[PDB]
Design an enzyme around this catalytic site. Structure first.
Site, mmCIF file in Angstrom:
data_model
loop_
_atom_site.group_PDB
_atom_site.id
_atom_site.type_symbol
_atom_site.label_atom_id
_atom_site.label_comp_id
_atom_site.label_asym_id
_atom_site.label_seq_id
_atom_site.Cartn_x
_atom_site.Cartn_y
_atom_site.Cartn_z
ATOM 1 C CD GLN A 1 -9.879 -33.203 -18.141
ATOM 2 O OE1 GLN A 1 -9.823 -32.074 -17.655
ATOM 3 N NE2 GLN A 1 -9.732 -33.426 -19.436
ATOM 4 C CB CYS B 1 -8.066 -30.135 -20.663
ATOM 5 S SG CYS B 1 -7.689 -28.360 -20.514
ATOM 6 C CG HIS C 1 -11.450 -28.537 -23.150
ATOM 7 N ND1 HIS C 1 -10.934 -29.181 -22.047
ATOM 8 C CD2 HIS C 1 -12.017 -29.499 -23.914
ATOM 9 C CE1 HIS C 1 -11.177 -30.475 -22.141
ATOM 10 N NE2 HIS C 1 -11.835 -30.694 -23.264
ATOM 11 C CG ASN D 1 -13.647 -33.997 -24.211
ATOM 12 O OD1 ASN D 1 -12.665 -33.296 -23.972
ATOM 13 N ND2 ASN D 1 -14.835 -33.751 -23.689
#
Length: 215
Positions: free
Chosen positions: A19, A25, A162, A182
């Site tokens: 990202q 996110c 997040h 992630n």
């Protein structure tokens, strides 16, 4: 509810993405979920566009944050349920700046009819994930900066900040854990992944769980 389930083993998860310096996110969480749901709906695993959301989703704030739930509703109510492929709409917010929304020159990679919000209970979230696939969840990632590997048995669980993707769990291990994808490159954690203890609401993992519905 099986003892353990890893959607990666079934090839239902795409490679880890980056990202960059953009707080997108939420977009990566929402898209990561759609990609998996699309595959599970009997379609080839396709990389979808996070940029579509960052640039066009005006109900969220691109690099300044957003909510996976708003993203889902925007796709359905503002973009006729369409999600472009990443090839057609490459990510270009790495430097922290989002280019304006481009209404054309893209190909639709997936479509969704809506979304469901999962109950705030890890056991129930696991049961759902085990049958319906990867779920988008919000977590407190304040202690994630120092994560190098292994199962995180203690996680600061105070404020959600997040968005991530829940790809599986293992209740048969010494310490039951969740498998989370992630979006901070493969250089972080276990090749872009992180494992947190399951059953004690680590990082507030059960607070904001949801998934898109293909239909």
């Amino acid at each position: 509810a099986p003892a353990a389930v890893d959607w990666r083993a079934r090839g239902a998860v795409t490679a880890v993405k980056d990202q960059g310096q953009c707080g997108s996110c939420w977009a990566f969480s929402a898209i990561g979920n759609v990609e998996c749901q699309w595959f599970l709906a009997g379609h080839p695993l396709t990389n979808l566009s996070e940029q579509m959301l960052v640039s066009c989703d005006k109900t969220d704030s691109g690099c300044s944050g957003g909510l996976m739930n708003n993203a889902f509703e925007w796709i359905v109510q503002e973009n006729n349920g369409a999600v472009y492929t990443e090839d057609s709409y490459p990510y270009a917010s790495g430097e922290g700046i989002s280019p304006p929304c481009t209404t054309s020159g893209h190909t639709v990679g997936a479509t969704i009819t809506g979304h469901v919000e999962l109950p705030q209970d890890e056991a129930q979230i696991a049961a759902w994930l085990a049958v319906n696939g990867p779920v988008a969840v919000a977590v407190d990632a304040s202690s994630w900066m120092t994560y190098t590997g292994g199962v995180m048995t203690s996680c600061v669980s105070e404020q959600l900040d997040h968005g991530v993707l829940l790809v599986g769990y293992n209740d048969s291990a010494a310490v039951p854990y969740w498998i989370i994808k992630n979006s901070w490159t493969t250089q972080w954690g276990e090749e872009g992944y992180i494992r947190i203890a399951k059953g004690s609401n680590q990082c507030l993992v059960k607070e904001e769980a949801s998934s898109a519905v293909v239909g």
